[PDB]
Amino acid sequence: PQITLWKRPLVTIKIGGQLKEALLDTGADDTIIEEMSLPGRWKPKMVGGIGGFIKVRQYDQIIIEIAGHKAIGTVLVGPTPINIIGRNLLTQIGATLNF
Amino acid sequence: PQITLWKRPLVTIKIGGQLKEALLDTGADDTIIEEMSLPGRWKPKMVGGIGGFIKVRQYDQIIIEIAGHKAIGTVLVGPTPINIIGRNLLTQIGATLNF
Numbered sequence: 001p002q003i004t005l006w007k008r009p010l011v012t013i014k015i016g017g018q019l020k021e022a023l024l025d026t027g028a029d030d031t032i033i034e035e036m037s038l039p040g041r042w043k044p045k046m047v048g049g050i051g052g053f054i055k056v057r058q059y060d061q062i063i064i065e066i067a068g069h070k071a072i073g074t075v076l077v078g079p080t081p082i083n084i085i086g087r088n089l090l091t092q093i094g095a096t097l098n099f
Numbered sequence: 100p101q102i103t104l105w106k107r108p109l110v111t112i113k114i115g116g117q118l119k120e121a122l123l124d125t126g127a128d129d130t131i132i133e134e135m136s137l138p139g140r141w142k143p144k145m146v147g148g149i150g151g152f153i154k155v156r157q158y159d160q161i162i163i164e165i166a167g168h169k170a171i172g173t174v175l176v177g178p179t180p181i182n183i184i185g186r187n188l189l190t191q192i193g194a195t196l197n198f
């Protein structure tokens with residue numbers, strides 16, 4: 001699909017058995033998901049943006065379905081105000097920015 | 100152009116007669132630029148990002164050239180870690196997300 005940007009580019013994602021809404025975000029290096037339980041081992045990490053830094057749990061090799069498309073990668077879990085799909089997973093689904 | 104996302108999508112912008120680098124950011128509603136002097140009156144705005152809220156100055160009807168494309172619109176100025184081009188100006192240059 002070709003997504004115009006008059007509105008936030010929100011899509012449905014499936015992660016750890018749950019269905020969620022998330023933002024397709026070319027400005028995000030990594031994917032960040034709101035507080036949830038995911039299986040496996042994790043490591044703590046700090047992620048910085050506007051307003052400062054937040055502490056997140058880094059999970060590796062997680063499978064996510066993005067708009068019907070299977071992708072695997074690192075997922076950061078923490079107190080984010082919005083679920084964000086960042087470049088680590090956008091590349092896997094072949095997303096491009098075009099103008 | 101068609102831009103892939105293996106690397107940050109950085110472009111050159113020209114604002115206030117200066118050349119600067121900025122991130123094309125579909126996850127940003129607004130365009131936010133680091134501290135610099137712009138003409139005219141400004142208005143106050145609060146911007147909420149991943150780590151908290153920041154106060155910025157809002158300037159309207161600012162001419163900015165984005166990777167060679169001329170856009171005219173609202174720019175926010177404040178302590179952002181990186182210049183960000185958000186959807187308000189991405190739509191002016193006709194950018195879309197495709198996959």
Ligand SMILES: CC(C)CN(CC(O)(O)[C@H](Cc1ccccc1)NC(=O)O[C@H]1CO[C@H]2OCC[C@H]21)S(=O)(=O)c1ccc(N)cc1
Pocket residue numbers: 025026027028029030031032047048049050081082084086122124125126127128129130131146147148149150181183185
């Ligand atoms: C600051 C830039 C370099 C990075 N951000 C991504 C984002 O797309 O720039 C962010 C994604 C985001 C969206 C909404 C809430 C929180 C984060 N939006 C954002 O800060 O936008 C600001 C300006 O415009 C307003 O609209 C959105 C919120 C304001 S970030 O969320 O801090 C971020 C940083 C690191 C990683 N791995 C993932 C995300």
